[PDB]
Amino acid sequence: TPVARYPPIVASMTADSKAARLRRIERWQATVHAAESVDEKLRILTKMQF
Amino acid sequence: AAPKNRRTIEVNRCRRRNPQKLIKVKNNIDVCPECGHLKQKHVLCAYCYEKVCKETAEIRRQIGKQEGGPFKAPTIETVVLYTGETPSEQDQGKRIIERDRKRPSWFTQN
Amino acid sequence: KARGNEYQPSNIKRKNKHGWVRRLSTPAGVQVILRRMLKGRKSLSH
Amino acid sequence: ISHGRVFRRMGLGPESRIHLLRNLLTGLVRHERIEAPWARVDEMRGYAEKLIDYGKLGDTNERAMRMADFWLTEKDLIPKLFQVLAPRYKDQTGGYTRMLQIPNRSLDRAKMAVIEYKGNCLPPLPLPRRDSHLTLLNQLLQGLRQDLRQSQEA
RNA sequence: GCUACCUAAGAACAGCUAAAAGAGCAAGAUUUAUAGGUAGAGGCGACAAACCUA
RNA sequence: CUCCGCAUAAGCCUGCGUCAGAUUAAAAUGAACUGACAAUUAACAGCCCAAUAUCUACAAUCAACCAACAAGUCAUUAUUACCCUCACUGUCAACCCAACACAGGCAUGCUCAUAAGGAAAGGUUAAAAAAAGUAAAAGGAACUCGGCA
């Protein structure tokens, strides 16, 4: 008696769209949450020079 | 290989004006009964098709407003209702799209 | 492998090599200016 | 020689072909009526019909869900397939889609087709209609049919 | 302003054996930006009699 | 898809901002062409310094230990003189040298796979020949100027 397993309704991660870019921004921000030390966090947040 | 000689206009006319090069007359053209415009027998009328597409575009714009965002396809059927119309018993429990227009004669409520 | 790209623009080089002061620096260069003045050149030098 | 070659060569190769059809199929499911080059719509029509058959297996079916997941790039369509499209055709055994040639598009004069999922809300397409029964030729054939009934009865 | 050589003051070079540093696999007789110098009876050349904006 | 990308330097000089167009790209929206209008604001960077004498043996390499050789970018004092202040210039772009199928060339910092930047298919058909790629029975350099390791 299994239930219906649907895929999550999220935007594509590789598409050329605005929602896809917002999902890629959430992807690198997820690596800051997963970073253990503060040095690793600061490194990811400040390594892109614009 | 470079051409050995210039081709004369006489020769070139025979080549260019050969029946094989001439545009063929089309016999499948007809008059559309609905609008009176020309169409080919095996192809949808351009005038009538554009009329359907114009209304279809307006309905799709209305669907966009109700959904109000991407990835929001509804899980129920959709019904288009024009001004002066009310939801039918069959057309109950369905997404309702309201068009600020009178129902076109060609578009028949089912 | 590159062809026809002899020109590597440099303003310092262009002024130093063909500039007004360079032309006046020698008598031959002054005659260069005189010839162009005679011909009516719009640009006597770089 | 291309004897018995059922599939067309499209895009940049085999994988590109499937992705091109997948994008067309995804658009058809969302909009229920799309217009594209005739050959591509014809190539995609088979997948459109078969997709409905997988939707009839039900969302609980694992293989059907895997098919919908791959062929539907926009995941919100997957619920629409199982819960809207599939139930719509529960009675029909086929012929879910209708494909009609439309005038050549202006830019490249490509042969064009319109394909839709039968039963959509959108305004009906100007379908070709056979001649009226009341026409002179049909009336002569109607009289002939009636006489053949009397002869058969006798 | 190409190229050859040179001068001034700069710059670049991950890992791997890694003693030895070396075009070993992949820090040098290396590569490279800038400015300057050497001019045709010439210049420059690890010399092809080559190159010196075809 | 990513081959990059962003920035600086150098070069270039208004060269896809607005409006309009009868001009233009395959394309009667686009526009890099035409007309008009607008714009880049210094803290970054450039642009520096009174005289006379005098001073300056000890590299750099995490500079400490152990070492060297090709022997090294980095420093003053004395007396005199001097009360004043924030000017000027660069700051735009899809950009340069080329080649005219990116054929190619191009210094530095950062990112090291991208948060940045991009689109190989005008439509169709699926003949030959041609190019590239992939797979291949048995054999495995045979037949060929000469295979590979």
Next chain:
RNA sequence: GUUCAGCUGU
């Protein structure tokens, strides 16, 4: 360095 052994649409 060969021969040999080995692999390849040469």
